[PDB]
Design a protein around this nucleic acid. Structure first.
Ligand code: MG
Ligand code: ZN
Ligand code: ZN
Length: 1259
DNA sequence: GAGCGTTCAGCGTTCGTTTATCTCCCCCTGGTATAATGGGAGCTGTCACGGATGCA
DNA sequence: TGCATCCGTGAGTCGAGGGTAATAACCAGGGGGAGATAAACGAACGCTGAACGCTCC
């Protein structure tokens, strides 16, 4: 397995594969149910239906295999061969592949200079083509053919003379005869009028005969090849009057002749000349055409593969005529489609054999061509072959396409054995690395292991007897089962699996019932609540696989989210509420026994048990040896004339008993914490522990926090009641005052002084102010000790506006299609809405449910496309060779006489390693090649340096993937990233995981469309696809004087650049709403108006570094608007992938095509060779292209095919004949090989293990 | 030797065998002699994006 | 050269489950495999005892 070469299969190649030929539409005898002879399913060609049995019944036995029975010709072998062996159909008349024509023009290519409308006419028997002309003959014998037409021309003139003479005589005779009789007044005039009408008809006929004769002669003189000829009658006149000079034909046979006579090298030369000297769209037509035709000359394969002579047939097992229970049958649709082409081909042979006309044979050839088209791609032309009428028939390409196609349903994602499923429940008594596994569930998973142990322990005699024992479920099995599951991990998994913490290994543990017990800390990583949520269970089998589940995927080595290095295994609903009550100051209750001194922390618990002391009360408490005091307590000490070291001996401390209890959970070396804990400070110490302490201590401490948190949440006494939710007393008055304020506007609208649209905007603003005022009144009313406020202030769950609409008024509600009602909701859910208030509220509620389902769909699509472009980024080098970094602002917005750090320093500059040292006083503070952390960043801001240059993923110069140093330290582990990690897949998941969480839109459009640029997930998708924004704001090229022209038709902005350079004229919309002053200076980087900057022009003018800054900054503001935090390295990896290619312009010396994407590294190599060759280098300019476009233009056709396009990529790969080297990730999942990422690397997988000599010496 | 005692023997003597004849329905093909001479028929509304393809 | 049009592609995740319709119709001939009765050999038996030995008077 080294390369998956693909190309065009020629006619001889198809015959070579075949082990026979299908000659009938027969499938199976209706009575015996056995395959027929020389039809579909035939055993002579495909293989024997039963193992080693032939068709006639001779040679049934297994002995004489590998022979051919002389009776029926069946070769005895295994029945499985039917899945491999394939046949072929011979076609009487050639047909043309539906793929290579009838598609996009990058695959058909205009290889013959014919329009698709032209092709439709010729191959479907509606117009002729002149496949060949004897242009030399025509010149040599020209006077003879000229002599024949000239004498032929004479005859019409002689005939015209006589008919006209008779016409002249006829007019003279009838007028004269009538006038002698004189029967009426005007006999001569009426008949002469009739007579001249007859002359006109004869004269008109004379025009038809001469002009038709003229028309047939002039088509001779334009008898160039590939000339379509629409009029069938005219062709017959050409053909009958003269043969042996022009050769004409119809259909796919004509095309085959044209490709035979093609001289493709000369066509390429003339196409190159047009590219060398051409203008307008004429150059582009030659440019696209060059792409297809050049591929044919370089490749050995001939173009004749377009027109197939023999149709291969799928092996019978892949299109099964399976018996169905109940005596019915089940057949695959390929049989029906294969039946039609066999039927129509067979009839064509009959029609050709006897003498038949052209009309009848053409219709059969037309139907044969249509039948083959339906087989390869049903529905690419007209109506599909519906068969039963209820549904389109499946087709060859239909199996290779879409979400349900072979690629995306049976090669990337398969169903698996040794797997299970069940609902999940919460078990608090578990440890972090433990899960409950139901008895019955585990028994069916571990059935092979239980059977092996049952035999060894002699409870079961043999393998079949062991099988029977477990199926019955005898008592002995359960004892054996607990023995075998121990120390054997199982991989839990929830269904959406957005990010890599979706799959986590656990140590199983048997539990009765039928629901998987799970650990409450790990819920948010799975995103699992306990409404009802089935979770799949997989079992790792081999020694390598289960080793991976213990080390890599365990649930205790995954404390930190890889997105931003934030804790994920301390959720907050109950635990955080408990700890908040436990560590809070007095006055939360009656602080009994406060302001006293206690002998030891034990004695305080004694006082608490008696009830004198309370848990939340300030007290003086002593402290045993070894407990570190606060960091600010280290300089001060007790009063003594001697030096003292209070850091690890006795010390009193002003605190509360609860804080003393809480600290005992933390490890002994940890300094004391004396403040109320909340949620933010709680997350901090878990993050602090993960940095400075080993992994085992972090996992153990969380369990202590879980137990203490749950215990005190019970004792905290949070509840809900009708008297707990207290409505603001002031509220009623506040609402009435606004109503009176409102009503004057209503009054002054009745008199017509204000338009309704202006009134709606002014009322919404008035109501919005009202909601804030009643919120403030309510916030003041509530006491800090009540339940509802306590569980929001603590950060447990909920938000302020949610609490507002339970007690205070809900406020304005968004009407359908983003409008506001003028009459907001005045009642609270406690007070109970009215009927009409409830109806209007539904408009927003249902819309939110429908929209949320859509955002999941789009976020899933965004993640999938991101993964393709972001793969092939693997850490494959310890350290890069280079010095180029990126300059980031550590500190900004510094008020006068003080230094203020940057607001987003964590996501931006943390966990990066300095490209070069930093000197401010002439001395290095932070040396180079040191990753930045809390301590180092503090050093730099204290000394006052305002920027830093950190090495980063963009400027990495690694020939394969990215080095470890440029990526900097990872975030899920807090150490330098390991070699072989797949940073690419990690980055894609991190961007896509909070996509569902975004859900942001303009609150109200205001009645204007286009003023507000795309927000949220559409904006993210727009940024990553390189799409020009909906609201586009132009960019200044350089300095100069700018001014505005307010033309009536449309607005306009014209800027006169300084230094005499060429004028530049910018257009704008009529509602431009610009902001720059008139006749004033402009700079290079500013944007002229409000909107969203176009990423392409920022690349064009500013530079590659600037567009990197722009893209990372733009997408981050979407995320930071909500509250999610993604470290900039994750963004940077994807943006690195977009800038990789380069667009070549003026491709004279590089010798490849102009104006197509080419990767940067190949461009550099080709230029280096050409200057070595003496030729001047070809230029290139950087080009940014979307994640979709970047993914498709990859070297590996197999990975590209497994992406969105599965026809175009297959079609052009066949033309280009691209051998797929199998290096990569997606394509190594298709074949079943080991992915080059992590343990699959050459370096990690090839190691060897031997003991030491001292180990052998002992035993 | 008497009288009967075991056991090859080759030889008949038809019965053993498999192997040769010979009589029968599904299955395929061909043929009807007034005159008869261009389909029914099922649709249709997502959404954005882009690039080919037509045409003023 | 620009503007107008249509065509192709993609659009989440795991759960639950099995059947679809309609019009000249016949002798007439005749082939071709699928099931029904006498001839070639050798093996059970068959009396043929005959031809050998095994004990007994
Ligand atoms: Mg749920
Ligand atoms: Zn056979
Ligand atoms: Zn590097």
């Amino acid at each position: 397995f080294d390369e998956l070469r693909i190309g065009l299969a020629t006619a001889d190649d198809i015959r070579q594969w075949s082990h026979g030929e299908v000659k009938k539409p027969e499938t199976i005898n209706y009575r015996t149910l056995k395959p027929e002879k020389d039809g579909l399913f035939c055993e002579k060609i495909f293989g024997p239906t039963r193992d080693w049995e032939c068709y006639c019944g001779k040679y049934k036995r297994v002995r004489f295999k590998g022979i051919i029975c002389e009776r029926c010709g069946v070769e005895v072998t295994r029945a499985k061969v039917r899945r491999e062996r394939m046949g072929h159909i011979e076609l009487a008349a050639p047909v043309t592949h539906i793929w290579y024509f009838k598609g996009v023009p990058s695959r058909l290519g205009y290889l013959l200079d014919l329009a698709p409308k032209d092709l439709e006419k010729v191959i479907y028997f509606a117009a002729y083509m002149i496949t060949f002309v004897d242009e030399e003959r025509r010149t040599r014998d020209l006077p003879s053919l000229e002599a024949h037409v000239s004498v032929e021309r004479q005859q019409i003139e002689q005939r015209r003379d006589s008919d006209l003479e008779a016409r002249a005589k006829k007019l003279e005779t009838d007028l004269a005869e009538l006038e002698a009789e004189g029967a009426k007044a005007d006999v001569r005039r009426k008949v002469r009028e009739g007579a001249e009408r007859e002359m006109k008809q004869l004269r008109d006929r004379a025009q038809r005969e001469i002009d038709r004769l003229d028309e047939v002669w002039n088509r001779f003189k334009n008898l160039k090849v590939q000339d379509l000829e629409g009029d069938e009658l005219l062709y017959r006149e050409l053909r009958d009057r003269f043969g042996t000079y022009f050769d004409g034909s119809m259909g796919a046979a004509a095309l085959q002749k044209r490709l035979e006579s093609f001289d493709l090298d000369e066509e390429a030369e003339r196409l190159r000349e047009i590219i060398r000297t051409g203008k307008g769209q004429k150059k582009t037509r030659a440019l696209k055409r060059l792409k297809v035709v050049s591929a044919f000359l370089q490749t050995s394969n001939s173009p004749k593969g377009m027109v197939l002579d023999c149709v291969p047939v799928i092996p019978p097992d892949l299109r099964p005529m399976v018996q169905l229970d109940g005596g019915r049958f089940a057949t695959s649709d390929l049989n029906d489609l294969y039946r039609r082409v066999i039927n129509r081909n067979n009839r064509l042979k009959r029609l050709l054999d006897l003498g038949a006309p052209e009309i009848i044979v053409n219709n059969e050839k037309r139907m044969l061509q249509e039948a083959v088209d339906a087989l390869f791609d049903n529905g690419r032309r007209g109506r599909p072959v519906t068969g039963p009428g209820n549904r389109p028939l499946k087709s060859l390409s239909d199996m290779l396409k879409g979400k349900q196609g072979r690629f995306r349903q049976n090669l990337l994602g398969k169903r698996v054995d040794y797997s299970a499923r069940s609902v999940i429940v919460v078990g608090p008594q578990l440890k972090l690395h433990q899960c409950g596994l139901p008895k019955a569930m585990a028994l069916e998973l571990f059935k092979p292991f239980v059977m092996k142990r049952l035999v060894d322990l002699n409870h079961a005699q043999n393998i079949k007897s062991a099988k029977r024992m477990v199926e019955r479920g005898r008592t002995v099995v359960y004892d054996v089962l607990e023995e075998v599951i121990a120390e054997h991990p199982v991989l839990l998994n929830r269904a959406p699996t957005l990010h890599r913490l979706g799959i986590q290994a656990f140590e199983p543990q048997l539990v009765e019932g039928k629901a998987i017990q799970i650990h409450p800390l790990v819920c948010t990583a799975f995103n699992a609540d306990f409404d009802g949520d089935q979770m799949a269970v997989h079992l790792p089998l081999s020694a390598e696989a289960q080793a991976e589940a213990r080390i890599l995927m365990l649930s205790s080595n995954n404390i930190l989210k890889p997105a931003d290095g934030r804790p994920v295994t301390m959720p907050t609903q109950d635990m955080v509420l408990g700890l908040f009550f436990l560590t809070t100051d007095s006055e939360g209750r009656s602080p009994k026994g406060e302001g006293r001194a206690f002998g030891s922390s034990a004695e305080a618990i004694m006082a608490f048990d008696a009830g004198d002391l309370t848990l939340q009360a300030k007290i003086d408490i002593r402290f045993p040896v070894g407990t570190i005091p606060p960091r600010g307590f280290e300089p001060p000490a007790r009063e003594e004339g001697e030096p003292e070291w209070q850091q690890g001996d006795t010390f009193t401390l002003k605190t509360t008993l609860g804080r003393a209890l809480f600290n005992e959970l933390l490890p002994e070396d940890y300094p004391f914490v004396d403040y109320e804990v909340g949620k933010k400070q709680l997350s901090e110490i878990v993050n602090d522990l993960a940095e400075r302490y080993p992994k085992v201590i972090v996992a153990a401490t969380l369990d202590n926090l879980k137990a203490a948190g749950f215990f005190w949440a019970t004792r905290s006494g949070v509840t809900v009641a009708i008297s707990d939710i207290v409505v603001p007393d002031a509220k009623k008055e506040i609402v009435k005052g606004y109503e009176g304020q409102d009503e004057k506007v209503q009054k002054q609208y009745e008199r017509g002084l204000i338009t309704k649209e202006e009134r709606t905007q002014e009322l919404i603003a008035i109501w919005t102010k009202a909601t804030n005022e009643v919120a403030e009144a309510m916030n003041d009313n509530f006491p800090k000790t009540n339940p509802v406020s306590m569980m929001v202030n603590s950060g447990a769950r909920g938000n302020m506006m949610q609490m507002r609409q339970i007690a205070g008024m809900r406020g304005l509600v968004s009407n359908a299609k983003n409008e506001t009602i003028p009459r907001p909701i005045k009642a609270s859910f406690r007070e109970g809405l009215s009927v009409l208030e409830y109806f209007i509220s539904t408009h927003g509620a249902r819309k939110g449910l429908a929209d949320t389902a859509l955002r999941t769909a789009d976020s899933g699509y965004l993640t999938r496309r991101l993964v393709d472009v972001s793969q092939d980024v693997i850490i494959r080098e310890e350290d890069c060779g280079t010095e180029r970094g990126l300059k980031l602002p550590i500190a900004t917005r510094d008020a006068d006489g003080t230094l203020r750090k940057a607001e987003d320093v964590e996501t931006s500059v943390y966990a990066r390693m300095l490209a070069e040292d930093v000197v401010i006083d002439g001395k290095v503070i932070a040396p180079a090649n040191v990753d930045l952390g809390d301590v180092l960043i503090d050093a730099l801001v204290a000394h006052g340096v305002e920027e830093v240059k950190t090495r980063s993923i963009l400027t990495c110069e690694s020939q394969v993937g990215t080095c470890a140093m440029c990526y900097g330290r990872s975030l899920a582990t807090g150490k330098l990233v390991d070699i072989g990690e797949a940073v690419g897949i990690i980055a894609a998941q991190s961007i896509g995981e909070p996509g569902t969480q975004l859900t942001m839109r303009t609150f109200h459009t205001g009645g204007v469309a286009g003023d507000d640029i795309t927000q949220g997930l559409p904006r993210v998708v727009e940024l990553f696809e390189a799409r020009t924004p909906k609201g586009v704001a132009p960019i200044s090229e350089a300095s100069g004087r700018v001014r505005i022209e307010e033309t009536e038709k449309t607005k306009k902005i014209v800027v006169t650049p300084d230094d005499g350079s060429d004028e530049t004229a910018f257009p704008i919309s009529k509602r431009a709403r610009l902001l720059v002053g008139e006749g004033d200076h402009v700079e290079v980087g500013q944007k002229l108006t409000v909107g969203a900057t176009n990423p392409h022009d920022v690349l064009r003018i500013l530079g590659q570094r600037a567009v990197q800054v722009h893209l990372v900054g733009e997408v981050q503001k979407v995320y930071n608007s909500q509250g999610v935090s993604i470290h900039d390295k994750h963004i940077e990896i994807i943006i690195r992938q977009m800038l990789r290619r380069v667009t070549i312009i003026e491709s004279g010396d590089a010798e490849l095509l102009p104006g197509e994407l080419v990767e940067r590294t190949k461009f550099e190599t080709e230029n280096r060779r050409v200057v070595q060759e003496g030729g001047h280098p070809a230029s290139g300019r950087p080009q940014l292209m979307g994640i979709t476009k970047a993914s498709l233009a990859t070297e590996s056709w197999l990975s590209a095919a497994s992406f969105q396009e599965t026809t175009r990529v297959l079609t052009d790969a066949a033309i280009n004949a691209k051998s797929d080297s199998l290096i990569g990730l997606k394509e190594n999942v298709i074949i079943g090989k080991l992915i080059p990422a992590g343990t699959g690397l050459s370096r990690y997988r090839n190691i060897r293990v031997e003991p030491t000599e001292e180990a052998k010496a002992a035993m």
